[PDB]
Amino acid sequence: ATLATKKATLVAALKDLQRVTVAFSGGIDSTLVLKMALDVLGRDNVTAVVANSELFTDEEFDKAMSLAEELGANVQGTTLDYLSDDHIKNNTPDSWYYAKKMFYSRLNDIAANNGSAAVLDGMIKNARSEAGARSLLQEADFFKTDVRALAQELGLTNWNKVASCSVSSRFPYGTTLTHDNIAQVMAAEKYLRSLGFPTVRVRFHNDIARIELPEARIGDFLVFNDRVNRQLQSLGFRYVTLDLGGFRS
Amino acid sequence: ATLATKKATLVAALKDLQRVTVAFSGGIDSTLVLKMALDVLGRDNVTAVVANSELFTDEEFDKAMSLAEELGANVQGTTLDYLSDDHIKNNTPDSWYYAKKMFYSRLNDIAANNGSAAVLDGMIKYRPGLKARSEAGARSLLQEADFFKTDVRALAQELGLTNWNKVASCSVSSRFPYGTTLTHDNIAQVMAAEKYLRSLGFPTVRVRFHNDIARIELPEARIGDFLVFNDRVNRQLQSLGFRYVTLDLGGFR
Amino acid sequence: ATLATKKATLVAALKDLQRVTVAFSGGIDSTLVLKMALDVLGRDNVTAVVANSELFTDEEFDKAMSLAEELGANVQGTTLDYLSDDHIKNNTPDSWYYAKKMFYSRLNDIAANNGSAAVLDGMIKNGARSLLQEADFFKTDVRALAQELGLTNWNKVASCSVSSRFPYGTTLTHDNIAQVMAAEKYLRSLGFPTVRVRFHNDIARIELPEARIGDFLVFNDRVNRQLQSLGFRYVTLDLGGFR
Amino acid sequence: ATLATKKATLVAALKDLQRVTVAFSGGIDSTLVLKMALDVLGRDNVTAVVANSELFTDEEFDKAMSLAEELGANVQGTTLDYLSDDHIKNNTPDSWYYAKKMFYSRLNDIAANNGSAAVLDGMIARSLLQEADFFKTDVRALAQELGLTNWNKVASCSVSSRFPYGTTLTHDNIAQVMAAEKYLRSLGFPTVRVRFHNDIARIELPEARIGDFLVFNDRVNRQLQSLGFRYVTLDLGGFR
Amino acid sequence: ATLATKKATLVAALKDLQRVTVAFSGGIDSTLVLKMALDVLGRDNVTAVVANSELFTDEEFDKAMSLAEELGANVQGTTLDYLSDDHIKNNTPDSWYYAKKMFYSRLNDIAANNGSAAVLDGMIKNLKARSEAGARSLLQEADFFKTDVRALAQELGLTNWNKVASCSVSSRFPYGTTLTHDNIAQVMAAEKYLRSLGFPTVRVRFHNDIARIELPEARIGDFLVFNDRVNRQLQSLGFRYVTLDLGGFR
Amino acid sequence: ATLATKKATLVAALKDLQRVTVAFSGGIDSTLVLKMALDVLGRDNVTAVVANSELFTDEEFDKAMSLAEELGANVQGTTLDYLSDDHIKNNTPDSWYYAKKMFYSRLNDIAANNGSAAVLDGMIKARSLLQEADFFKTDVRALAQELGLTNWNKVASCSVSSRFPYGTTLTHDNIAQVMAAEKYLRSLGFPTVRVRFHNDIARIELPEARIGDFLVFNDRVNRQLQSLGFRYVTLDLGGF
Ligand code: NI
Ligand code: NI
Ligand code: NI
Ligand code: NI
Ligand code: NI
Ligand code: NI
Ligand code: NI
Ligand code: NI
Ligand code: NI
Ligand code: NI
Ligand code: NI
């Protein structure tokens, strides 16, 4: 009921596992799991693994890696190659499930090799089980309130403040993903973010880019129409369009 | 040579044919041919034909018929079904030509039935075969008389012409990519969308059709004035059947 | 029928009337009636009357008189007392009826005094004669016959009584009318010809066509200050736009 | 005049008042005092009080209650019936005064009953931050030094400001003003006022945001009309 | 005097000259003069002259030639080197006079060569270079005001004429700034590009390496989509900084 | 390579220098050095010098003096006079150089008189220990956040000479003119701005992402900068 009880539940679970591998994204939840794993088991009994793949930017990978080092963890990157999977390459609605399966399977191979007793992720009370990953925060009945509370108790102040999605969301279901069109959309969103628009999606429709921006920024945005049009055309789109519905129509 | 030179060739050619059928669009050129046909041959020897189809608005057809009435011609509308042709229904790059072929075929049939010696259009100055005009024996007397756009404006008001169509319409096919199949419903979809955008105060507009995406082209100078309508345009074009409603950052042209 | 028929119908009505008095506002429709009245009957058989009153701007009254002269009419101004009628002063929903009655009554007396057979106005399709509407003219036909006649100059923005700027039941006064008229005159001088300053006591509620509101933001502060000095305590833009 | 100097001033001030009651709004200032009260005096010697009333949003109260619990304080809600006071319900120009009187009267009773030595608020009743010469630069510095990251960043005014003097406050027009401002904030405008003029809503926004706002004109109009206003207007003077 | 009186006076004057050369700008005044000359004397006895120079846009010149051809006149272009006259090149308050002097001097030479008895311009009632050349203002001799001009244009069915009263590009340079064929080319290329974006009323004021764009304030909102292209384009025309004047059009 | 590596080299350099003088401008970089000087060398072995001049704002000095005192450093202001040099008074393309020498010449006496072993400044990728320790802008923001630094000049104050064309003579009249114009624009919500001086023309540089938000202020800026002495007030289409 109290936070002190739930933290104690989490300290006891970590002591029992003795040695863990942590699925680390840089968000506040995995930051709390990793910091508690370090404080309870020590640096040499924790391995933080950050996933690098073609579906996420190298920028999020470098930031997640540097966050783990700043907490004082041994951090190890692993590269997954999600497009080896037919369900991800053709982006079926079931893609998410197979993506998680490939993710958790690699962490069990890593955890097996380093002698950990379990793989931990950051999920809270509101294919992980198929691979046997442990969600200690959810087992100790943490809610988002309890994460912020115990993060403040531990002096954690730095974490990825916006948790991303995979670039597959920029493609309609059934569209085949390639290393090129993925690079195309990610270059396009990175360029838009460089003009000062941190929240943006460049949705992919073959020869059409359909830009989603938050509606409150559209007025500030017209000064960039022509540069955005020309820049995304050089990236391979034949038309660059602004979606009148805005961000997530 | 001079303008008097070109009217004489054009008067002579009209006098020889005696009775004519005129493909009439409402533009300065077809207005000019038709007024010269009437002034040289009289009302009873000239028929103006205006084409109705789904690829143009019911509004533009009503306007072309009235201008012909105001010049004093007997005017006949004829309605085509361009989508009966696979090159038009499937919107190939030659589709313009096959459209003219079906049009000139219908006017020749009209002209044969009323006893005219030729079909006249208002043409002055890359295809799959013969010129659709030469295939039909249609004559472009303004072009045979070497009319320039200066001579058309010049001899038109030597004739006192005051009203015509300053905005040349464009077949609704242009809103569809090459290879995309046109249907009576998606044509209606694009046309309702453009009629609605125009009613909000944007006379020059295109709604390009990209399946579930509508890509609106507007003159860039109007995009600032336009944001006040983003939400209404999005929901309205959605009710017309598009899943996404988008503005092209390149603008109209 | 054809436009040539509707022009012929209109020429026939005018020849039969022989002498007419024309209610002239300066818009395209009354401009067309007046020019065709002149082209059929001549200057000496046509009288153009422009109404001046407190419910319409002095600017449109001046422009209509000069436009009537420029079309070649004998033009006569007349001044109406719309606020002498209690239904107009207290802005009741039937105020338009007593206003219209008073207008046509003044114009019938002018016509009786000058021997005209009818008062003509500019009403179109969709006891005064509306020859355009009897001939089935639409707004499309009016632009056609205006261009065929070479008419180019008229007031492109239709005037409407200043009563519409006040709620029903609000008593119109010379002061609140003057302030609403000063406020719209200033808005029009910045480049917004169709505008309304609706009067809600200490609140001015500006209606503009929505397509102009983006162009308008550069004027927010100057408009706010000027209408405040005209007597409004708050100056507001109506998010619904014009009408 | 270093920060460590004033934190020593502030903890020393807190050490004297061995038991404290903290008037807690959720802003950076009351959050700093509340964590500082807990860390210097302990949970059992600090009571955080959140006021529930009709003049502030249900959202600010829920957020102040969850944040206070997240700081690890024993939290007490208290509900003030501000409109039972004629001086507040008819919104005279003196109303602010009767409101603060009812508020601090409620917290003095809570403090007396729980054995506190004083009521603490967040001013920059004792304003220990202002006695210790804290500035907002100083508040952000020491909040981070304790690892504070969560607070309400939009400080609410009393809803009385949206009503003309002499206008009678009701549960219905309050609900209307609060619904309109919640909707405006959800489109991306955290600083906003919907002034109430009977059938007219007069929206104040910072002029610097009015350009960003044009894309929402139509939705704001339809939404505020559905909340009961007949006309929805933007004030060309902007916010204040 | 009635409008029929004033039109009759003008028909009498034109009948007397038989053969005329008309200084034609495209404005309502010269358009009325040119149409009356044609209506009274016929196409073979009227020559419309439109002046081309570096101080006016090709767009205003081409439109005046088309307006004259569309009225049914024989139209002739003539090109004036206004910068050959130092009084014009040094951009003083009297430079417009010397421009008119050079203009009417050229029109007398054209009229001499084609046998016209007079040069006609469009001046109306309310100047010195006009009288010193013996150019005649038949609208002003018949007591036409701008109200008389619009009336007879409508009775003549004239509907098309040039509404922008085109001004010489010297106004884009301060008094005393010396005009060159290169800096004029710079200012006019810049305004041609601005007008091509949908801004017919514009001024590019010249301040050495700085362009100061004046637009009507009601269009400045519409303009933001063009900031970057206008900046780069005017820089490639030679300005080092490209600016929008917050005061607007004057 | 790692952030912990770069912090360790920087503490090692400071321990070797024993006593330091830090040229303090108020930016994130010099703020980062100055707190790190305190953490390794202590208050009694670090001297913070903030330079006051005619080419910098009075506002940037108060913030630099207030930051230093807040940071808990022994802080000393020193007043220089860059316009005494003829190459800066006429603003030759070489101005920055004669200006830079005069700054570092006065700062060496502080250290020398102070007995300090080196003068430290804040340059990243006189000793520039941040650049010697291979700090980039990401590394500086990271270690500033790890150290709990929350207050610094988020808009870097630059020399007012930058607003004048080469060859233009600087005056006390036109400097104040340029400085008054930027203070007024920033008060409207534009913290990043340049008012460029072209005699009778003011040429305003803003970030392009804010130019749309800016149209509501055109008229007030125009009248205000006209009364400061500019004949024309213009916005630069290339932006800041
Ligand atoms: Ni691959
Ligand atoms: Ni499957
Ligand atoms: Ni069919
Ligand atoms: Ni009654
Ligand atoms: Ni506009
Ligand atoms: Ni109650
Ligand atoms: Ni009392
Ligand atoms: Ni030369
Ligand atoms: Ni001389
Ligand atoms: Ni030197
Ligand atoms: Ni903005």
Three-state SS across chain A?
A: CCHHHHHHHHHHHHHHHCCEEEECCCCHHHHHHHHHHHHHHCHHHEEEEEEECCCCCHHHHHHHHHHHHHCCCEEEEEECCHHHCHHHHCCCCCHHHHHHHHHHHHHHHHHHHHCCCEEECCCCCCCCCCCCCECHHHHCCCCHHHHHHHHHHCCCCCCCCCCCCCHHHHCCCCCCCCHHHHHHHHHHHHHHHHCCCCCCEEEEECCEEEEECCHHHHHHHHHHHHHHHHHHHHCCCCEEEEECCCCCC
**Alpha helices in chain B, H assignment, sequence order:** 3-17, 28-41, 58-71, 86-89, 95-114, 132-136, 141-144, 149-158, 184-199, 223-226, 230-239
Burial (CB < 10 A; 0-12, 13-18, 19+), residue D190, is exposed
Burial (CB < 10 A; 0-12, 13-18, 19+), residue A153, is middle
Measured between beta carbons, the chain C residues lying within 8 angstroms of E158 are 150
The label of the residue with tokens 């001015």 reads: C204
Nearest to E69 among B153, B219, B223 (CB): B153
Question: Residue D49: which H helix or E strand, with range?
Answer: strand D46-52
Residue E35 CA from chain centroid, whole number: 18
Q: How far apart are CA C32 and CA C37, in angstroms?
A: 8
The label of the residue with tokens 């399977």 reads: A105
Ligand of minimum distance to the alpha carbon of E181: 8
Residue B35 neighbours by CB under 8 Å, 6+ apart? B71, B156, B159, B161
Q: What end-to-end distance do the CA atoms of chain C give, in Å? A: 34
Residue A240 neighbours by CB under 8 Å, 6+ apart? A208, A209, A211, A228, A229, A232, A233, B248, B249, B250
Active site residues of B: 170
Q: Is F203 helix (H, G, I), strand (E, B) or coil?
A: strand
Q: How far apart are CA F170 and CA F165, in angstroms?
A: 10
Residue of D nearest to B225 (CA): D214
Task: Report the 10 Å Cβ neighbour count for A152.
Answer: 19
| C-alpha separations of D88 from A134, C218, D77, D94, D108 in Å | 56, 40, 21, 8, 20
Min Cα separation E194/chain B (Å): 11
Q: How far apart are CA F194 and CA E236, in angstroms?
A: 23
Strand-pairing partners, residue A49, are A23, A76
**Ramachandran sector of residue D121 (left: φ over 0; alpha: ψ -120 to 50; beta: rest):** beta
Strands, E, within chain F: which ranges?
Answer: 20-23, 46-52, 75-79, 118-120, 194-198, 201-205, 232-236
Burial (CB < 10 A; 0-12, 13-18, 19+), residue B172, is buried
Q: Which of A197, A194, A203 is nearest to A167 (CA)?
A: A203
Task: Report the 10 Å Cβ neighbour count for F94.
Answer: 11
Q: How far apart are CA D113 and CA F132, in angstroms?
A: 61
Q: Please report, for chain D, how many H helices and E strands are present, in that order.
A: 10, 7
| C-alpha separations of B247 from A198, A216, A242 in Å | 21, 16, 5
The dihedral sign for the CA sequence A105, A106, A108, A112: positive
Any catalytic annotation for residue C58? no
Q: How far apart are CA D221 and CA D238, in angstroms?
A: 17
Q: Which of B3, B173, A109 is nearest to E43 (CA)?
A: B3
Ligand of minimum distance to the alpha carbon of F89: 10
Residue F153 neighbours by CB under 8 Å, 6+ apart? F25, F26, F27, F28, F60, F63, F64, F67
Q: Is F204 helix (H, G, I), strand (E, B) or coil?
A: strand
Rg (CA), chain F: 20
Question: Residue C235: which H helix or E strand, with range?
Answer: strand C234-238
| CA C219 to centroid of ligand 5, rounded, Å | 13
Contact criterion met (CB < 8 Å) for F4 and A224: no
Q: How far apart are CA B108 and CA B112, in angstroms?
A: 6
Q: Is B128 helix (H, G, I), strand (E, B) or coil?
A: coil
Q: Which of C157, C207, C215, C169 is nearest to C190 (CA)?
A: C215
Q: Is B78 helix (H, G, I), strand (E, B) or coil?
A: strand
Q: How far apart are CA A38 and CA B116, in angstroms?
A: 98
| C-alpha separations of C119 from A236, C12, C77 in Å | 69, 16, 15
Half-sphere exposure of F231 (CA within 13 A, CB side): 6
Q: Is B51 helix (H, G, I), strand (E, B) or coil?
A: strand
Q: Which of E223, E243, E224, E247 is nearest to E234 (CA)?
A: E243
- The torsion angle over the Cα atoms of residues F106, F112, F115 and F121, rounded to 10 degrees, is 40
Contact criterion met (CB < 8 Å) for B249 and A243: no
Contact criterion met (CB < 8 Å) for E147 and C71: no
The label of the residue with tokens 């992720």 reads: A121
Q: How many CB pairs under 8 A join D and F?
A: 38
Contact at 8 Å (CB) between F48 and F74? yes
Contact at 8 Å (CB) between E156 and E35? yes
**Alpha helices in F74-148, H assignment, sequence order:** 86-89, 95-114, 129-132, 137-146
Measured between beta carbons, the chain D residues lying within 8 angstroms of C236 are 200, 202, 233-236
Q: What is the resolution of this structure in A?
A: 2.7
Q: Is B244 helix (H, G, I), strand (E, B) or coil?
A: strand
Q: Which of D90, D164, D181 is nearest to C201 (CA)?
A: D164
Contact criterion met (CB < 8 Å) for C211 and B224: no
Q: How far apart are CA A178 and CA A166, in angstroms?
A: 14
Residue of A nearest to E232 (CA): A227
Beta strand pairing call for C46-52 and C196-200: unpaired
Partners of chain F (3+ Cβ pairs below 8 A): A, C, D, E
| C-alpha separations of B18 from B4, B24, B45, E206 in Å | 21, 18, 7, 63
Query: Residues, chain C, total?
Result: 243
* Angle CA C176–C181–C185, to nearest 5: 150
Partners of chain E (3+ Cβ pairs below 8 A): A, B, C, F
The label of the residue with tokens 């939009």 reads: D154
3-state secondary structure chain E: CCHHHHHHHHHHHHHHHCCEEEECCCCHHHHHHHHHHHHHHCHHHEEEEEEECCCCCHHHHHHHHHHHHHHCCEEEEEECCHHHCHHHHCCCCCHHHHHHHHHHHHHHHHHHHHCCCEEECCCCCCCHHHHHCCCECHHHHCCCCHHHHHHHHHHCCCCCCCCCCCCCHHHHCCCCCCCCHHHHHHHHHHHHHHHHCCCCCCEEEEECCEEEEECCHHHHHHHHHHHHHHHHHHHHCCCCEEEEECCCCC
The dihedral sign for the CA sequence A77, A81, A85, A86: positive
Q: How far apart are CA A206 and CA A181, in angstroms?
A: 9
Domain positions in chain C are: 1-160, 161-243
Q: Which of C8, C118, C26, C10 is nearest to C65 (CA)?
A: C26
Contact at 8 Å (CB) between A215 and D215? yes
Q: Is B82 helix (H, G, I), strand (E, B) or coil?
A: helix
Contact criterion met (CB < 8 Å) for B157 and E199: no
* Angle CA C208–C212–C214, to nearest 5: 115
Rg (CA), chain C: 20
Residue D190 CA from chain centroid, whole number: 14
Q: Which of B248, B235, B172, B179 is nearest to B211 (CA)?
A: B179
Partners of chain B (3+ Cβ pairs below 8 A): A, C, D, E
What was the structure determination method?
X-ray
| CA D16 to centroid of ligand 4, rounded, Å | 80
Look up residue D230 and give its DSSP letter. Answer: S
Q: Which of D23, D15, D63, D3 is nearest to D185 (CA)?
A: D63
Measured between beta carbons, the chain E residues lying within 8 angstroms of F239 are 227
Residue of E nearest to C63 (CA): E147
The amino acid present at C17, given as its one-letter code, is L
Q: How far apart are CA B77 and CA F40, in angstroms?
A: 94
The amino acid present at C144, given as its one-letter code, is A
Phi and psi at residue A247, in whole multiples of 5°? -70, 110
Min Cα separation F220/chain C (Å): 8
Measured between beta carbons, the chain B residues lying within 8 angstroms of C4 are 69-70, 72
Q: How far apart are CA A16 and CA E136, in angstroms?
A: 111
Structure tokens at D133: 């010469």
| C-alpha separations of F239 from C195, F186, F192 in Å | 34, 15, 11
